């Protein structure tokens, strides 16, 4: 199981294409995490619906909520946004 | 060695018979070869762009001129090959393609001046050079004096050309009389920004191009074209263009001139459109070669214009040469001869000719998409190279116009296709009949120079960084 | 000659073409040669033997 | 393999020289010439020259045999096709049933269909090194490397126990990398 | 046991050393650029023997006077 | 944008209109009193075209204060409404309308001149890879623009935000 | 080996006079030999992986190893794998199914179809913007020359279209390529996202871009070209038109527009959207009167085209993959559509009005079959790669612009008018008096549709197969802060 090594944008001098690369790559594989932990909370929580039935609005509103909170903010969005630009100025 | 080729040339014809032209012309061919192998060397005096003037300052050598000195042999090797041997050994042939007693003489004169013109660092020496060419040139046109529209086209060659060179020397008096001075050298950014030449230095200049053909002054050299031999238009059409265009690049006189760049646009715009209705082949090429010389026109309004003229110059030398062998070698497989002087002349005459000869229609085709600028032919990176130039100065309305005309001339020129491979009921069945071996294989060196030079495109930009920086 | 004939059988050039190509071979040839020692002259090509006999 | 032998194409071809053109050879429909078309088509299944030949001989041989064979191919389609009947078994049999091979099968059979077997096996087994699988092994190495007293747990309680460390906790390190955002 | 695909690490290296190769030609197209926009001297550029740029006009009635620098 | 005198302007182009199709008729008249007489309307050609062009131009760019392509476009379409006229049908009217238009506005576009502004050229601007923290000109690259021009520009929403999201739905 | 090779296809062609065995034995090895570079691709990373040069100046013969790159790169990601496995799947094919109707100059035909392909194959491997234009038009002259001569009646226009109408939006993005170059003084796709130009030149070079994006694929309203060079193009013309010269279109949006012109991408995008639900309601429109069945096929492809589209600039990674499996499953249902009519039907009857036509079912129950399954293939049936493509790609232009990528759902309706009025009266009714009973599809025709459907089956019932290979091009272009 390879773990490479962490790398950002702001640190790099864009000239060495090796650190660009691994720079993108991370930056994409650390979204594919946030993506699994967002199918794990939805997992629980088909979970959660399946076995509680009638009350599974009480037993289930954090996980329902939770999922809901991180649908938009848990998908891809591409290094290309972050790269072209510099939050800072 | 041109000089003492001419003289040597001058005593032999006067004493040799008119049987022996034909040799005398292979004589002369294997001279020009043995000359452009053995004295090639003369490239590394230019390294570093070192520049001579010579002949107490009325000469100029540099790799520039250097360049295009070896080109305009290399065009009067293949052209004096073309009336040194014989397509085929029938009677029909004999009458077809004959050379005049005094063509080759007259051939190196011409070459002559068209080498004095590009190596010009003076004015005196510009309009002599100008008038030497242009003499010659006209006795080339009218040296087939048995035709009447030679006879005709060289009358009107001499009255339009004796114009043009008025205008010239009007040009040139003018600049004398403001500056008191017949070189260019003696301008400077100073002098420019002081003084207003732009009238002289534009007179100078359209009395050159009007030369050559250019809108709107075009017609009078298209019916030339049309009307001289075909061996002899294959000639008349592209040495003055070659030299008056190089001398106009080397001096860059007319740099982001409003009216070069409406005189560019007018030309490309005839010179497609034109071309669309015609029916007769040399007509048709005779537009091409005025939509080329616009292409290259262009070049004429910006500075460090150097690669992009030479690549479009020597691609377009090939491109013409070989068009018209293809269309020479074309007549063999004609039902119908229409006179001596021009055997083929409408282009459905070649109605059908994949099914006589595959491989000319190969040809035909590799040379026509060359001239479309299809990649990855010789004609794509000309083009490309000229765009470069153009949009790194800020050319935009003219490349858009560039585009379009490219777009209209591809019609006329895919009609020579067209009407090549479209099929014909009297197929030939067999024949006992050679094409001449040399011609043969020059065309096919043309052929492939023309499908597989881009290999070379890294390596020629690597030698011209160095003998052009 | 031999490649394209010019009157469909081969025969031999004859003595005034041979000797016409002598001599303007002998022209060319003498023009290269000059030009190679000009260019040693001017420091193009190599010049060792060149140089130290022009200064002897 | 070597098959080639000159003798017999310059036997060959006055054999067919007698016939009239494939074109007209059949559209009588005697029985006799009938046979003879039949028996030198038949000729044509029968191959006659392997590759040790075709490497090594003269491009005369090569004229010869090609016209042959394009001659005998006619001959047998032009019957195959205004008789319904084929030229082996030798009269002209309707035995149709089998016994028929077009040329295209072998190639393609034989390699084509074979390279896209091997193209669907290497999709599906290159699908497992897909990013989820190792984005799933590396939350879970993430949750492990954090918090190893799990590593202590039963196996059925373990991953309910990651479960609730993924749910509770933002594990990844995307901020992180994001150093100039703060 | 039949994948034998390269190394990540040696893809990178190997990309990298194309991307250097790259902006190595980069470089040297925009100096050359420059260069040729550059002026060259008066020997290189018009005549390396005969380098003076200044006339000295007909020798027959040479005026005391006449020379200006 | 200070106005354009259209009258005056038109007035000119007027002059000059009717002296080329003097110019256009007595050429006209050689190549072939006579001369008007078999001119082709050539002269009310040249001044047609000339105050169309010329008025459509000014009052153009007056009414909206900005000098660009568009006036070219609308000029252009005035001077093809002239030019097919003369056909004397709708349909040729309208191409001649359109697509002059659409000619002269592609002219205006490109800088409605048929030689180079030299200085705003390529090869006479800025170019290359800026320096620390330089503002970016027509033809200058870099390897990051700053967010707040990419916001300002682009506009907000559609995934352009202030802030990237991971860093503004962090939990503290 | 070279050498030797030449010397094997000399005699082989001295001895068969036929090359046409040489090639389908060739182009089998080069599918095999692609299936064998996927074997050896690493999926664990977002570089280039099988790169080499051409033309350098150290080496204008060979491959360069010098530190300066002045020649024409080439190699492969996970994205041009995808298309260059279709190039290969798809290109014997092409040949065999031409493998009986060309009884003249047979070898010369064989030859422009081989060339073309490999043209388009050698194209997805380019890594820069001068090879790629190169390479993009090299196939113009062997179009036009093909269709020109083994072309159907009005094959002489035909060409002339497919010359033209493709030069002039070539011009175009080579205007593009011309100021990108001289902008940036590089050329390269590897690291092109790198460089940021000014909003104001990102503006004016897509339009160039653009120009040529819209004859390629092609959309409204310049898409006219297309079902005349359809209709006059011989077979093997029409299969390789269809399934790969227009998903060259599609991969040159992914490949030379998106990376480099991203804020002008996002700017111009709602212009895309028009230009995209435009083509797709008035060509699906304009397909239900006409009466060739080549053209009507040929008008199907214009309408999927709209949908890639309207999925590949959706900014977001569900449409781009929409995109890339639509691409992929039109690629094999078109050249099946365009087998049927303009191998079996016209060679069979040399005829494409659809009043001849009627009632195929009686004689020809196989024909039926496969006409019923690639018509419902086309239309977007699921368990078909073309529905994933289509639903995918629709999701990501709902979620770009919900209002338009609504509208555009009115495609399924749409497809399926066109397509099944066709085969309805194709399949249906009594017996055609006009033409007479012909064999049913044979051996050679059942294995080409074969091929086909079982692709497209494969991959709509596990669209996840492909995932593999475009996992991280899903991410290397959408533009979100
Ligand atoms: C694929 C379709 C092709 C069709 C479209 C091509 C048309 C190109 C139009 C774009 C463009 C050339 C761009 C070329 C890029 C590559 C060319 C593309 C291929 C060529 C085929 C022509 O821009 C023209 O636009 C016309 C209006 O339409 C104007 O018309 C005229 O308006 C009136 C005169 O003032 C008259 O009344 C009349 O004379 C006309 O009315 C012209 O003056 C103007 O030059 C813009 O170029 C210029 O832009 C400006 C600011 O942008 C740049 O300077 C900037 O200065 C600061 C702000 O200024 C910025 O702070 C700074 O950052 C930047 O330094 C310049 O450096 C320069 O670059
Ligand atoms: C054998 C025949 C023998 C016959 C001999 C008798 C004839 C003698 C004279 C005729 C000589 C030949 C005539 C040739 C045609 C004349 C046209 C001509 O030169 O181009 C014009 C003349 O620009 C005048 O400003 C010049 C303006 C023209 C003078 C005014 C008109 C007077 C008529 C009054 C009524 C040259 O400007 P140009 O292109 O550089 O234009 C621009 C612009 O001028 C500059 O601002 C820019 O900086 C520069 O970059 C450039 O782009
Ligand atoms: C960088 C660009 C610069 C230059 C590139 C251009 C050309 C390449 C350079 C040098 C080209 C030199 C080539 C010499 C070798 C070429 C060569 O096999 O002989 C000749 C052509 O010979 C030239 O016609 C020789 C004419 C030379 C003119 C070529 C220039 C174009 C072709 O043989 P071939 O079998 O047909 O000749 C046979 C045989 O010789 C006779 O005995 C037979 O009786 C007769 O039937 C004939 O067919
Ligand atoms: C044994 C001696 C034989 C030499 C005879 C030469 C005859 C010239 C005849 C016709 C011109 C034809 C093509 C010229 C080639 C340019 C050389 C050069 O490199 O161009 C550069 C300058 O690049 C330029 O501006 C652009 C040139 C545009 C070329 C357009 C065609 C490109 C494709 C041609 C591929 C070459 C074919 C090779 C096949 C194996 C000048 O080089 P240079 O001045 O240092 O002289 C070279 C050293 N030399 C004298 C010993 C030979
Ligand atoms: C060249 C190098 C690469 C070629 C690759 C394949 C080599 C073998 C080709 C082949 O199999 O034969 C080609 C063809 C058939 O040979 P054959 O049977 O003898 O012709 C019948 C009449 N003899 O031989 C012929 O019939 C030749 C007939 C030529 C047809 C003329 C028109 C075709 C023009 C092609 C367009 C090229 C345009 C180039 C521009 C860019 C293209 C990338
Ligand atoms: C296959 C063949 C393919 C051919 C493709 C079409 C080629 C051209 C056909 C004719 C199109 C003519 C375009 C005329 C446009 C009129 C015009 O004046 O454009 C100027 C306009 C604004 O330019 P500007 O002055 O810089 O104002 C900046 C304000 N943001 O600039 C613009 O904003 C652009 C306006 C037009 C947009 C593109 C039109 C279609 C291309
Ligand atoms: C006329 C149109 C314009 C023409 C412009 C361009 C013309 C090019 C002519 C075709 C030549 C390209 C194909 C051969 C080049 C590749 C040869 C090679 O060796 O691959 C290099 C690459 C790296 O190899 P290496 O670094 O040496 O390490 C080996 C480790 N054992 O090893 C590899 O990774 C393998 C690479 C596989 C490449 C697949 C290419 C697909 C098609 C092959 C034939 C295409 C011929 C096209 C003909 C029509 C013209 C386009
Ligand atoms: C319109 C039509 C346009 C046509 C365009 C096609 C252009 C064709 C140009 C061919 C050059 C490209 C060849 C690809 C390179 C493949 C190769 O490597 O060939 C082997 C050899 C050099 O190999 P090497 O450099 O040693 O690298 C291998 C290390 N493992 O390579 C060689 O030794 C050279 C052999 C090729 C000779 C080709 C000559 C022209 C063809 C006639």
Redesign the interface.
Known sequence: ????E???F??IN?????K??????????????????LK??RK?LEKCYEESGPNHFEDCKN?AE?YLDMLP?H??????????????? | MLILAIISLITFVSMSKLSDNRAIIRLINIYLILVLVLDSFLYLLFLNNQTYTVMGELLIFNSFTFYIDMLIYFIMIVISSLYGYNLYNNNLYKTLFEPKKELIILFLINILGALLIVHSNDFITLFVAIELQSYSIYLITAIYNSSYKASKASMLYFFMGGILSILIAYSINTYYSVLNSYTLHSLDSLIINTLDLNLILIALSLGLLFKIGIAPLHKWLISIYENTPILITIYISLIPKISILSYLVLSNISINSLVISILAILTLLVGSVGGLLQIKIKRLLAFSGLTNAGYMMLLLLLNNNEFSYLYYITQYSISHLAIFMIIIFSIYYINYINNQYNPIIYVNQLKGLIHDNAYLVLSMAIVVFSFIGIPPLLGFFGKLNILMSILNNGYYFISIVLIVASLISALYYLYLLNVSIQDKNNILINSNETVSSVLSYILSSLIILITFGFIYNSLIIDIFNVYFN | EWLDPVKGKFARPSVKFLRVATMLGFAVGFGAAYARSSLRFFGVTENAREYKKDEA | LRAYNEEKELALKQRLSQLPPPGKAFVTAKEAELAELAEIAALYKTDRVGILDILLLGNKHARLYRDNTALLKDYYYNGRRILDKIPVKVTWEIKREGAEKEDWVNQMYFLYAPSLILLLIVMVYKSREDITFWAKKELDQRVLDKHPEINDAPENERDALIVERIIAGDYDKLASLQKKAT | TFFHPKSREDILNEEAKIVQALNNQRELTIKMHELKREEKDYAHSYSPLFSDPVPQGGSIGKAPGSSRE | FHPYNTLGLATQSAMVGLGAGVVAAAARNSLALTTFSKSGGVVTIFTGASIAYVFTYCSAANLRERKDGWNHMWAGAATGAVLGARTKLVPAFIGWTVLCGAACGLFGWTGARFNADRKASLEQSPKGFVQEDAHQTFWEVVHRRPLSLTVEQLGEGRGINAVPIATATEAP | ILLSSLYLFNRILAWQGNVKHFYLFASNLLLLFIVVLYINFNTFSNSFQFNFELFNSLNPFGLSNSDISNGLLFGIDGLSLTFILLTVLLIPLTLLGNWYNINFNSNLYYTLVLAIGLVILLNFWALDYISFYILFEATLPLLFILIHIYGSSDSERASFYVLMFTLSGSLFMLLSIVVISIVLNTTNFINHNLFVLSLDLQTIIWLGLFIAIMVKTPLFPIHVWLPVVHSESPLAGSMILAGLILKLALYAILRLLLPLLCEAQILYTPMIYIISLLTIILTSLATLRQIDLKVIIAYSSISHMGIAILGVCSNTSLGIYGSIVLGVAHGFVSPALFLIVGGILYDRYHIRIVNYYKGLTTYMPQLATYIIILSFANIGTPLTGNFTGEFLSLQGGFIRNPIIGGISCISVLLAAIYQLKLTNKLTGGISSIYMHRTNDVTIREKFIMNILIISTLIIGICPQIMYNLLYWTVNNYIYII
């Not at chain 1, 864009?14 to 090796?18: E, L, P, R, W």
């Open positions: 199981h390879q773990r490479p962490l790398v950002s702001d640190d864009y000239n060495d294409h090796k660009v690369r691994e720079a993108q790559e991370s930056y994409t594989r650390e979204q594919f995490i946030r993506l699994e932990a794990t909370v629980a996980l939770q903010t998908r891809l969005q591409g290094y290309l946004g972050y790269q072209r630009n510099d939050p800072s100025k």
